[PDB]
Design a protein around this ligand. Structure first.
Ligand code: SF4
Ligand code: SF4
Ligand code: SF4
Ligand code: SF4
Ligand code: FES
Ligand SMILES: [Ca+2]
Lengths: 146, 588, 905
C-alpha cells in the first residue's frame, strides 16, 4: 500500500476514503514509520521483498523490480546517478495495473511512488556521482551527447 | 512539424492552379518526403499540363529531371494509380523557387508516352536514357536510340527482371565489337545519328574519341565540318556507364555510400551529402549541429579541391602548363587535411546515415590553419600568372556564349547558370546541412556565360569556400558526431563495443541493413559542377527500390551542340575545358 | 468482426485474438511469448497495444493484443506513444541481463529478440548494474544450451510439454532466476525436440550440428525441398554454404508439417556431407578404378548395354518418380522391377488400394488434428512416421478444446483450455508388439503379435457391423476391451484409423480397412491413414513393377545379363548372400547412387547420382500427395571435377546414347511430361510445381538472400577469377541473389522466409494468408487421387491366433527414429544418438534359455549367425524375439519373419 503522511491520519479507514487519498485500505493493519527511519532504506527493504517474491511469469515485475532494487541500493550507499529517480518513476508508471500479469507488481510499486512523492528529498540525497555507463576505449573517440 | 515529415503539399498554389485549369479528378496528389508536390497525371493530358506549367505567371522554366520507374515489384503503392511502369518529370520554377514532380502511369504492354522535347529540349537525352534503360517508347522523338548502352544491346538494364551482375566475358563479342569499331569508320551513315545533309561534297567528318587524354574522361564526338566551322555535332556518351543506379537497387542503404563517392569522382564528400540527406529524410533523422558543420567543412574542402583541378585543367587546355603543378601542390595540402580527418584522399566514404564515421581527430585545426594561410597567395599568383594573360583571354572570352534562356531550357546549373546572371544556388535558395549559419556570397555573372566568365566565377566560388572554411574553423560546436536516432548507421562505436542493445542495432544494421519505411525522398545540393540530386524510393526494405541520380554534367554535355554550332574546333576544346564536367558524372 | 487500428477499419475473424488478427493484416506488433501453434498466455507483455472503449475515447488502456479477442467494433492503437514506450521498456527490461554475445551467438542474423529490439527502436543502454548469469546444461547431440540469453518467454516449455508431450523439460527456480531446461544433464528425450531451435526466440537452444559448421542465415543458399527420411513428406528448407549442406530449416506447409519437423528430418541430413560419396563416374578395369567424365561414361555404358541381351532395372523408394520412370524407360516396363521385397510390395499395394479404392477419405497431416478418436493398428507411429504422432497428440487434446468451447472460452486462450480439460482426452487406442511413445496419452495399449493385432481389428470391425467377418476364440477380458474400443469409435463424430506397412503384416492392413469400412457403413466421417516406409514408397507402388526377388531370379537363372540399380542398397530388401551371389554372377552391374553402398565393390559401373540437395524431382508421400523438391546448390561450383548429375538425367542420357548414339542429358519438364503421358495415374505430378518457365513479373525465384556475402572471395583461393553463375535450366529457381523472394509473390514454393525487420522464422507470418493458416496462394503439392465413390468389400481372411513354436522365434520389429532409415544412419551425428542394438526377450523366454539382461546370444538367419546382447522386454509376448529393424545388419524385411537356433554365445 502507498505511504501516507501525518495529515492523512484523520480520515476514516474505509475502502473509498483511503482510495481517494491515493492509497489502498488493504488489510487495514497499518504500520507507523518514525523520523529515525530513512525512507530510502525502508523502500529498499520493501522492494527487495517484492523483487524476490516475483513469480517470474511476466517481464515488467520480473525484470523491473530488481532494477529498482539496484537503484535503491545505490541511493542508500550514496552512489546514485542522474536519471535514477526518473527511472524509478517510469518503473512505477509501467508496472501499474494491466501492464503486468497479476496485481503483485502494482502493489510493489505503490510504496515506491508514494515515498518518492512525499519524501523526494531523501531520494535526491543519494545521487552523488555523475552518470557513467561506459568506460573509455583507447583509440575510439566517444560520441559526446549533449 | 519536422523537415522530413510526409507532406502532400496541397497548400502549394500550383495544385490549386491545376485544379482550376484541369478539374479536380484529372490527377492524383501523392504524399511523399521529397519536399515537392508529386502529381500523377494521365498520359493523354501530359503535354497540356506541361504547357500550362510553362505558361504560368511565374513559370516552371527548367526540366530538372526526366526518368522512368519499374513499379511491378513495388508492394507498398497505397494511394497510387495502377502502374506497371511510370515516368516522372521534375520541373523547377526559379521565380517561385518551387518544384513539381509529374508522374505518368503506364501499363506493361502500352509502354509509350508523348515526347516532352517540344516543351523542353533536354528531354531528348532524358527520354533516350529512359528508353535505353526501361524500354519506354517516346512518340515523336527525333532519334530515339540507346544512349548509355551500345546500339546492339538486348533488353533494358533498369527493368526489375534484368539481372544486375556482369555476364561471362567472351573474347568473341570483344572481337565483334572491335570489327564494329573498325568498320564504323568506313560504313558511317549520317542519318542514324540524327544528322542531316550527309555530303554538299564539302562536309568533313571527324571523331574526337573514344579516348581522350584528359581528366574529364574519354568520350566521342562526331564533328561535321565546313572548313573549320562546326555545322553539326552529335556526342557519343555512355562509354563510362557503371550502372550506379542499378547498384543502388543492389546494395543496402549503408553499403551504397562508397558508390555515391564515385559519381563525380573529384567531389567526394560533396557527392556523399545528397544521398545521406535523402536517406536521413527516409529514416526521419535530424542530425545535430556539429554534424552539419563537419559535413559543410568537408564539402567545402572538396569543392576547393575540385575547383583548383578545374582552373588548372582549363589553364593547361589554354596552353600554360605550370599552374597545374602548383594547383596539385595545393590539392596535396587539401588532401593532407582530408587524409587526417577521413583516412582517405579521393573517395573518403566518410559521411554516414545520421552523421559521420568518426569524430574529428585531435589537431585538425592546425592543418586547416596551415591550408587557410597557404591558399590565398597561391590563388593570387595563379590569377596574375595565367588568368590575366591576354593570350588566355583571347582563347576564352566570347567562346561558346549563351544567355539565361538557353541555360534555362537546357537545365544548365552551377557556374554557367550564374554566369548568365540568374542567382540560383542551392545553398541559399533551398538551404541544407546548416548552410544558413554561414556568411558567404554567391557570385553571379553579367548575363553572358563565357568560358572566361565561368572560370572567373569558379575562382570567386573558391574564395567564398575559403571564407566558409574560416568560419568553420573559428566556430565549432562541441557536440556529437552522430545523431541519437535508432536508425543512425552504424551506432557510436564505443557503445557498440560495450552495450548489448547498441551491439544488436549495429549487428542488424551492418548485416541485413537498416530498415527504411516505405516512402520517397529527394535531396538536391549545389555540387562542385552544378546541382546534384538523389531521388530515393524505399519499398520498406533494407535496400533502395529505386535510386535516381541527377547530375549536372549530363545537362551540360547535352547543351554542347546548341552553344558550339558555327564555331571552330579549338573553340570546342576550350568549351570542353570550361564546362567543368567528368564523364563518370555524365554516365553514372 | 470489425476492428479499427490507428483510425483504419479492418475486417477480421472474431474468434481470433488481436495479435494474430493484426499480424494477418500486415501490421507489425512485437511479440515473444505467443506462437500461432501454441496459443496465447500473456507472459512476455511485449505485444501491448492501447485499447479504447469506443470511437470517442482518448485515454484508453494498455492491453496485451495476444490476450484480447478481436471482437466486433474493437478500437485499438499500435502506434500510440504510451504503447510504443511500454514496448520499448519491455525490450529494455529484457536487455538488462542479456549477455554481450551476438558475435559468438548462433542465433545472430536469425534472432527474433534482435529483430524486436530493432523494431521497438531501443538502442541506448542506461542500465549500469550487473547482469545475472546461468550455468548451461548438456542437452544431447542436437541441441546446445545457453541460458544466459533467455528472456523467460516460456515458449520452450509450452511447446515441449503442452504441445509435443515431452516430459524432461521444465521451468525451475523463481523471480529473475527462472531456468529453462532439464532437471539434470542428459539428452532431450522428445522425438520433436529439434523444433526448440525455431521455437526459442533467442539463442538458448541452438542447432549443435549446424554449430559445428556455423554460418549466418544471409550466407546460406536455400531451396524448397522435401525431407527424404520417411514417407510423411514434411517440407524443408535445406541451406548450404561452401558446397556442404549446413542446415535443415522447417519450411511452412499449411497442409502438411506446418511449423514442426521431427528430429530425424531436422538432424539426419549429415550423410550429404560424407566424404566417401561418389563424386564422378568410376569404372573398374580388372582390380583398378578409372574416373570418367559424363560423356565417356555414357558412351561406354551404352556400348556395353547394347552388346548385352537383356537389361533389367531395380528402382528404389528412395529415388524420385522421374528417376524411377527413367529407369523403367531405359530397360523397359516388362524388365523393370521395384527394388523392394515381395511381401513389402504386397503390403504397399494393399495400402495403396485401400487409399485410392477404399472409398474412405485419407486426411493430410494437418487434418489429422481434427479427428476425435484414433485407432492405431500395428504402426509404431512415433518411430516411423513421428509427425503423425505429433498430430495425433493434438487430435487427442481436441476433447479439452471441445469442453472449453462449450464454456465459451476462446480457442487461443490455451491455459484456460488446459485448465478446463484437466485430463479428459479423445480416445486413443494403439496396438503394437510392445510399448509405444503414444502410451502416455493412449486410452488403451494392446501389446500383442501382429496376427493378434489383426484379430483385434477384425473383431472390432465385426462388433461395429455384423456383415464383417467374425473372430472366434476371443477371451472375455479382450472382448470387454474390444467393446470399450467399439463404444468409443461408434460414438465418435470423426474416427481415424491409422495403419501402415511397417508392422509387416498384410492382415493388419486388411483389419484397418475393415474397421474403416464398418465405420463408413454407419454414416461416420471416418478417415484412414497409411504409413509407408520411405520417401517415395507410394510413388514406386503406383508405378509398380516386379519385386526384388523376381529380379534376383532373373539374374540368377542367367537370362538377364545387365542390371541397373538405382539408389538402392539391396541388402535392406533381401538377404545379403543372395544379392551378392546374383551380382557376382551378373556380367554387368551398373549402380546409379549418391552414397557409397555395399554393392559398389561388385559394380562394374558406378554413376555419381545426386542426393536430394543436388537434384530436382517429385516424391509421393503416404497421403498420396505429389511434392516437388528442388536442387539446393551446384556441386560443380566449388570443385569443378565433380560430375554428379540427377539420376533421371543419367538414365535419360543413357537411353538416348543407347538409341541414337548421342548424348542428350534432358530437361526436367520433359521427364515430367513423359511420366504423365505414359503413366496416367501419375498425371498429378505435372501440377505439383510450375515449370521452369515460371516467372514472378519476369524474374526467377532467388535461392539465396539479398545480403549474400563473399561472392568475390569464396572461390578466390582456387582462382581469383570469379566463375560464371550456375545455370538452372531445370526449374524456376536461380542459383543466385538475382531473383524474387517477396512474401506477396504469387507462388507456392518458398525457399526461405525473410521480410524486412523479420529475420527470424517469424517471417513465415508474412508469407501466410493468415498466421497459422496456409501459404498466401495455397500450399504446394497436389493429391494424385480423390476419394473413390465405392469402397472395397470386407476382407474375410481372418488370421489365426499366434502359437509359439519351439526353436522358431517370430521376429517382432522395433523401429527407431534414429536408426531405422538408412541415409539417416549414415549421418555421423546419429552415431551419438544411436542406441546400442539390443535383442528383446520375454522374461519367460529368457528364463527358459537361461540368459539374463545384457548377455550375448547368437541367432542364425539365412545360414549366418550373429550375436546381440539381451534386453528384457516385459510387454513382448512369448514366442517372439525383438529386433531393431533397419540397423547395421538387420534388414527391415526381417520384420514378421521367423528365426532359428537362438543360443547363448
Ligand atoms: S506481476 Fe504477478 S504474474 Fe507478473 S511476474 Fe510478478 S508475481 Fe508473477
Ligand atoms: S540471442 Fe539474439 S540478442 Fe541474444 S546474443 Fe544471441 S543474437 Fe544477440
Ligand atoms: S529458453 Fe528460449 S523459449 Fe525458453 S523461455 Fe527462454 S527465451 Fe523463451
Ligand atoms: S516425420 Fe518423416 S518426413 Fe517428416 S521430418 Fe520426420 S523423417 Fe522427415
Ligand atoms: S505475445 Fe502477448 S504478452 Fe507475450
Ligand atoms: Ca538441376
Amino acid at each position: 500500500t502507498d505511504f501516507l503522511t501525518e495529515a492523512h491520519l484523520d480520515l476514516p479507514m474505509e475502502f473509498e476514503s483511503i482510495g481517494k487519498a491515493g492509497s489502498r485500505l488493504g488489510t487495514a493493519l497499518a504500520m507507523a514509520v518514525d523520523h529515525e527511519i530513512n525512507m530510502v532504506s525502508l523502500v529498499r527493504n520493501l522492494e527487495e521483498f517484492f523483487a524476490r517474491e516475483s513469480c517470474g511469469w511476466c517481464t515488467p515485475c520480473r525484470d523491473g523490480l530488481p532494477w529498482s532494487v539496484k537503484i535503491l541500493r545505490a541511493l542508500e550507499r550514496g552512489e546514485g546517478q542522474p536519471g535514477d529517480i526518473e527511472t524509478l518513476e517510469q518503473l512505477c508508471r509501467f508496472l501499474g495495473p494491466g501492464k503486468t500479469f497479476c496485481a503483485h507488481a502494482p502493489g510493489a510499486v505503490e510504496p515506491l511512488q508514494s515515498a518518492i512523492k512525499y519524501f523526494r528529498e531523501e531520494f535526491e540525497a543519494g545521487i552523488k556521482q555523475p552518470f557513467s555507463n561506459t568506460h573509455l576505449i583507447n583509440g575510439i573517440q566517444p560520441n559526446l551527447l549533449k | 512539424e519536422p523537415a522530413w515529415q510526409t507532406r502532400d503539399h496541397l497548400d502549394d498554389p500550383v495544385i490549386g492552379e491545376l485544379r482550376n485549369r484541369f478539374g479536380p479528378d484529372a490527377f492524383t496528389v501523392q504524399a511523399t518526403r521529397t519536399g515537392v508536390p508529386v502529381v500523377w497525371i494521365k498520359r493523354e493530358q501530359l503535354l497540356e499540363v506541361g504547357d500550362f506549367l510553362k505558361k504560368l505567371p511565374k513559370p516552371y522554366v527548367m526540366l530538372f529531371d526526366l526518368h522512368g520507374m519499374d513499379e511491378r515489384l513495388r508492394t507498398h503503392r497505397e494511394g497510387l494509380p495502377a502502374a506497371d511502369f511510370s515516368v516522372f518529370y521534375h520541373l523547377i520554377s526559379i521565380d517561385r523557387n518551387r518544384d513539381i514532380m509529374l508522374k505518368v502511369a503506364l501499363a506493361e504492354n502500352d509502354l509509350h508516352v508523348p515526347t516532352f522535347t517540344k516543351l523542353f529540349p533536354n528531354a531528348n537525352w532524358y527520354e533516350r536514357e529512359t528508353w535505353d534503360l526501361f524500354g519506354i517508347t517516346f512518340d515523336g522523338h527525333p532519334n530515339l536510340r540507346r544512349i548509355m548502352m551500345p546500339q546492339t544491346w538486348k533488353g533494358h538494364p533498369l527493368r526489375k527482371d534484368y539481372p544486375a551482375r556482369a555476364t561471362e566475358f567472351s573474347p568473341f563479342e570483344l572481337t565483334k565489337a572491335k570489327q564494329d569499331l573498325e568498320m564504323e569508320a568506313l560504313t558511317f551513315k549520317p542519318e542514324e545519328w540524327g544528322m542531316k545533309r550527309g555530303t554538299n561534297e564539302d562536309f568533313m567528318f571527324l571523331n574526337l574519341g573514344p579516348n581522350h587524354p584528359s581528366a574529364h574522361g574519354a568520350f566521342r564526338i562526331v564533328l561535321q565540318l565546313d572548313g573549320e566551322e562546326i555545322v553539326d555535332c552529335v556526342p557519343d556518351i555512355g562509354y563510362h556507364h557503371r550502372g550506379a543506379e542499378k547498384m543502388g537497387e543492389r546494395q543496402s542503404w549503408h553499403s551504397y555510400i562508397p558508390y555515391t563517392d564515385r559519381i563525380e569522382y573529384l567531389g567526394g564528400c560533396v557527392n556523399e551529402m545528397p544521398y545521406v540527406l535523402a536517406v536521413e529524410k527516409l529514416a526521419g533523422i535530424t542530425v545535430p549541429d556539429r554534424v552539419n558543420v563537419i559535413r559543410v567543412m568537408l564539402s567545402e574542402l572538396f569543392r576547393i579541391n575540385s575547383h583548383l583541378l578545374y582552373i588548372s585543367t582549363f589553364i593547361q587546355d589554354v596552353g600554360a602548363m605550370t599552374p597545374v603543378f602548383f594547383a596539385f601542390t595545393d590539392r596535396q595540402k587539401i588532401y593532407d587535411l582530408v587524409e587526417a580527418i577521413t583516412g582517405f584522399r579521393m573517395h573518403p566514404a566518410w559521411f554516414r546515415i545520421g552523421g559521420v564515421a568518426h569524430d574529428l581527430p585531435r589537431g585538425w585545426d592546425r592543418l586547416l590553419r596551415e591550408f587557410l594561410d597557404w591558399m590565398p597567395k597561391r590563388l593570387a599568383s595563379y590569377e596574375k600568372a595565367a588568368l590575366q594573360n591576354t593570350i588566355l583571354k583571347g582563347r576564352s572570352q566570347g567562346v561558346a556564349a549563351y544567355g539565361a534562356k538557353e541555360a534555362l531550357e537546357w537545365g544548365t546549373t552551377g557556374a554557367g547558370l550564374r554566369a548568365t546572371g540568374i542567382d540560383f544556388d542551392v545553398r541559399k535558395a533551398r538551404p541544407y546541412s546548416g548552410y544558413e549559419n554561414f556568411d558567404f556570397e554567391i557570385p553571379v555573372g553579367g548575363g553572358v556565360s563565357d568560358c572566361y566568365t565561368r572560370v572567373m566565377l569558379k575562382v570567386e566560388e573558391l574564395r567564398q569556400s575559403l571564407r566558409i572554411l574560416e568560419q568553420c574553423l573559428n566556430n565549432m560546436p562541441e557536440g556529437p558526431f552522430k545523431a541519437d536516432h535508432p536508425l543512425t548507421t552504424p551506432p557510436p562505436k564505443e557503445r557498440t563495443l560495450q552495450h548489448i542493445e547498441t551491439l544488436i542495432t549495429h549487428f542488424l544494421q551492418v548485416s541485413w541493413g537498416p530498415v527504411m519505411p516505405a516512402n520517397e525522398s529527394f535531396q538536391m545540393i549545389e555540387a562542385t559542377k552544378g546541382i546534384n540530386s538523389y531521388y530515393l524510393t524505399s519499398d520498406g526494405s533494407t535496400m533502395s527500390y529505386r535510386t535516381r541520380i541527377r547530375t549536372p554534367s549530363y545537362a551540360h554535355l547535352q547543351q554542347i551542340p546548341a552553344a558550339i554550332r558555327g564555331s571552330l574546333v579549338s573553340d570546342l576544346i576550350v568549351y570542353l575545358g570550361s564546362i567543368d564536367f567528368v564523364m563518370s558524372d555524365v554516365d553514372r | 468482426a470489425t476492428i479499427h487500428v490507428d483510425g483504419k477499419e479492418y475486417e477480421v475473424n472474431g474468434a481470433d485474438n488481436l495479435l494474430e488478427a493484426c499480424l494477418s493484416l500486415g501490421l507489425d506488433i512485437p511479440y515473444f511469448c505467443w506462437h500461432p501453434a501454441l496459443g496465447s498466455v500473456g507472459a512476455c507483455r511485449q505485444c501491448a497495444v492501447k485499447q479504447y472503449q469506443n470511437a470517442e475515447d482518448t485515454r484508453g488502456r494498455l492491453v496485451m493484443s495476444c490476450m484480447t479477442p478481436a471482437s466486433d467494433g474493437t478500437f485499438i492503437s499500435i502506434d500510440d506513444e504510451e504503447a510504443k514506450q511500454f514496448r520499448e521498456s519491455v525490450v529494455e527490461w529484457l536487455m538488462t541481463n542479456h549477455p554481450h554475445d551476438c558475435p559468438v551467438c548462433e542465433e545472430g542474423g536469425n534472432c527474433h529478440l534482435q529483430d524486436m529490439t530493432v523494431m521497438t527502436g531501443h538502442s541506448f543502454r542506461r542500465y549500469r548494474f550487473t547482469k545475472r548469469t546461468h550455468r548451461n546444461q548438456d542437452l544431447g547431440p542436437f541441441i546446445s544450451h545457453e541460458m544466459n540469453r533467455c528472456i523467460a518467454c516460456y515458449r520452450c516449455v509450452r511447446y515441449y510439454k503442452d504441445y509435443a508431450g515431452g516430459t524432461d523439460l521444465g521451468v525451475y527456480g523463481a523471480h529473475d532466476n527462472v531456468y529453462f531446461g532439464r532437471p539434470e544433464d542428459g539428452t532431450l528425450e522428445s522425438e520433436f525436440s529439434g523444433n526448440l531451435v525455431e521455437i526459442c526466440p533467442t539463442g538458448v537452444f541452438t542447432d549443435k550440428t549446424h554449430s559445428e559448421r556455423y554460418n549466418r542465415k544471409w550466407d546460406m543458399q536455400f531451396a524448397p525441398s522435401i525431407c527424404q527420411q520417411c514417407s510423411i513428406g514434411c517440407n524443408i528448407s535445406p541451406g548450404e554454404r561452401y558446397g556442404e549442406l549446413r542446415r535443415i530449416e522447417n519450411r511452412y506447409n499449411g497442409t502438411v508439417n506446418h511449423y514442426f519437423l521431427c528430429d530425424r528430418g531436422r538432424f539426419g541430413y549429415g550423410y550429404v556431407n560424407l566424404k566417401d560419396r561418389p563424386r564422378q563416374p568410376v569404372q573398374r578395369r580388372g582390380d583398378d578404378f578409372i574416373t570418367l567424365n559424363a560423356e565417356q561414361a555414357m558412351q561406354g555404358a551404352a556400348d556395353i548395354l547394347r552388346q548385352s541381351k537383356k537389361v533389367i532395372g531395380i528402382g528404389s523408394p528412395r529415388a524420385s518418380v522421374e528417376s524411377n520412370f527413367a529407369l523403367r524407360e531405359l530397360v523397359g516396363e516388362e524388365n523393370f522391377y521395384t527394388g523392394i521385397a515381395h511381401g513389402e510390395q504386397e503390403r504397399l499395394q494393399l495400402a495403396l488400394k485401400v487409399l485410392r479404392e477404399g472409398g474412405i477419405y485419407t486426411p493430410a497431416l494437418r487434418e489429422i488434428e481434427s479427428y476425435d478418436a484414433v485407432l492405431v493398428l500395428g504402426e509404431d507411429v512415433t518411430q516411423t512416421g513421428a509427425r503423425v504422432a505429433l498430430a495425433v497428440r493434438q487430435a487427442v487434446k481436441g476433447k479439452a478444446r471441445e469442453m472449453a468451447a462449450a464454456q465459451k472460452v476462446a480457442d487461443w486462450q490455451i491455459a484456460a483450455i488446459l485448465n478446463i480439460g484437466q485430463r479428459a482426452k479423445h480416445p486413443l487406442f494403439v496396438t503394437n508388439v510392445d510399448d509405444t511413445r503414444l502410451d502416455d496419452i493412449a486410452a488403451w495399449t494392446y501389446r500383442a503379435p501382429v496376427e493378434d493385432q489383426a484379430r483385434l481389428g477384425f473383431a472390432i470391425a465385426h462388433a461395429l457391423d455384423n456383415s464383417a467377418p467374425a473372430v472366434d476364440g476371443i477371451e472375455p477380458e479382450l472382448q470387454s476391451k474390444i467393446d470399450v474400443i467399439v463404444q468409443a469409435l461408434a460414438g465418435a463424430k470423426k474416427p481415424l484409423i491409422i495403419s501402415g506397412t511397417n508392422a509387416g503384416s498384410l492382415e493388419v492392413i486388411q483389419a484397418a480397412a475393415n474397421v474403416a469400412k464398418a465405420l463408413k457403413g454407419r454414416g461416420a466421417d471416418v478417415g484412414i491413414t497409411m504409413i509407408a516406409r520411405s520417401v517415395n514408397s507410394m510413388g514406386l507402388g503406383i508405378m509398380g513393377g516386379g519385386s526384388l526377388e523376381e529380379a534376383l531370379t532373373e539374374l540368377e537363372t542367367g537370362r538377364a545379363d545387365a542390371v541397373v540399380v538405382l539408389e538402392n542398397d539391396l541388402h535392406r530388401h533381401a538377404s545379403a548372400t543372395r544379392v551378392n551371389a546374383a551380382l557376382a554372377k551378373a556380367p554387368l552391374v551398373m549402380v546409379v547412387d549418391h552414397q557409397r553402398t555395399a554393392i559398389m565393390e561388385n559394380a562394374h559401373l558406378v554413376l555419381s547420382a545426386a542426393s536430394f540437395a543436388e537434384s530436382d524431382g517429385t516424391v509421393i508421400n503416404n497421403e498420396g500427395r505429389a511434392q516437388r523438391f528442388f536442387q539446393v546448390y551446384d556441386p560443380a561450383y566449388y570443385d569443378s571435377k565433380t560430375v554428379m548429375l540427377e539420376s533421371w538425367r543419367w538414365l535419360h542420357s543413357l537411353h538416348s546414347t543407347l538409341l541414337s548414339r548421342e548424348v542428350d542429358w534432358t530437361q526436367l519438364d520433359h521427364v515430367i511430361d513423359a511420366v504423365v503421358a505414359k503413366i496416367p495415374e501419375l498425371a498429378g505430378i505435372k501440377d505439383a510445381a510450375p515449370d521452369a518457365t515460371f516467372r514472378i513479373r519476369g524474374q526467377k525465384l532467388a535461392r539465396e538472400p539479398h545480403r549474400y556475402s563473399g561472392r568475390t572471395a569464396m572461390r578466390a583461393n582456387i582462382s581469383v577469377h570469379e566463375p560464371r553463375q550456375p545455370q538452372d535450366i531445370d526449374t524456376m529457381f536461380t542459383f543466385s541473389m538475382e531473383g524474387n523472394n517477396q512474401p506477396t509473390a504469387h507462388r507456392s514454393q518458398v525457399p526461405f522466409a525473410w521480410a524486412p525487420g523479420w529475420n527470424s522464422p517469424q517471417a513465415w507470418n508474412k508469407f501466410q494468408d493468415e498466421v497459422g493458416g496456409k501459404l498466401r496462394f495455397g500450399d504446394p503439392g497436389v493429391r494424385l487421387f480423390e476419394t473413390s465413390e465405392n469402397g472395397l468389400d470386407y476382407f474375410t481372411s481372418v488370421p489365426a491366433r499366434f502359437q509359439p513354436q519351439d526353436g522358431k522365434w517370430r521376429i517382432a520389429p522395433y523401429y527407431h527414429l534414429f536408426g531405422s532409415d538408412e541415409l539417416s544412419q549414415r549421418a555421423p551425428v546419429f552415431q551419438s544418438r544411436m542406441p546400442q542394438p539390443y535383442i528383446k526377450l520375454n522374461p519367460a523366454d529368457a528364463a527358459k534359455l537361461g540368459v539374463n539382461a545384457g548377455t550375448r546370444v547368437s541367432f542364425s538367419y539365412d545360414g549366418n549367425t550373429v550375436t546381440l546382447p539381451v534386453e528384457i522386454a516385459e510387454g513382448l509376448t512369448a514366442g517372439q524375439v525383438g529386433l531393431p529393424m533397419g540397423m547395421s545388419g538387420i534388414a527391415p524385411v526381417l520384420a514378421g519373419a521367423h528365426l532359428e537356433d537362438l543360443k547363448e554365445a
